[PDB]
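Journal club prep, notes for RB
We'll compare a predicted complex against what the paper describes. Inputs for the thymidine-3',5'-diphosphate case:
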Amino acid sequence: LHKEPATLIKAIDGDTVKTMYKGQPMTFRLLLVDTPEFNEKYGPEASAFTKKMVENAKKIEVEFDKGQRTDKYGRGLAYKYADGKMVNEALVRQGLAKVAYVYKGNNTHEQLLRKAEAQAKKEKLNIWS
Ligand SMILES: Cc1cn([C@H]2C[C@H](OP(=O)(O)O)[C@@H](COP(=O)(O)O)O2)c(=O)[nH]c1=O
Ligand SMILES: [Ca+2]
């Protein structure tokens, strides 16, 4: 896989962000994770974590997997990076997302994320507390 440029338009919630990609606005849903909804426990903390991470970044990048690049809602499906740090992994490592929605052929970073989740579980962080 490879990273491509994107520029933040707006933080949305823990696992969705609006970014401009090849000059067009899109809403991206982060691959391989599930944050709580804003109305659910930790939902606001996940939203604020992702928002801080993308708003503070000097450089956002998007990385598509090998499979489907959009979902049925027309959202982009990608791994997102903020100054080189994967947002999807960072959420999981902080116990603010579960590994979820692991579909065959768009699961290149699964094992990296499962290892973050195990570590967040060991530390009993947030969702795992
Ligand atoms: C992350 C992800 C979500 N989705 C779809 C499955 C879920 O469908 P349903 O809407 O029918 O439940 C929905 C969950 O997204 P949210 O967790 O953003 O609600 O997005 C994909 O199809 N592919 C993906 O890789
Ligand atoms: Ca969600």
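Talking point for the session: The chain has three helices and eight strands.
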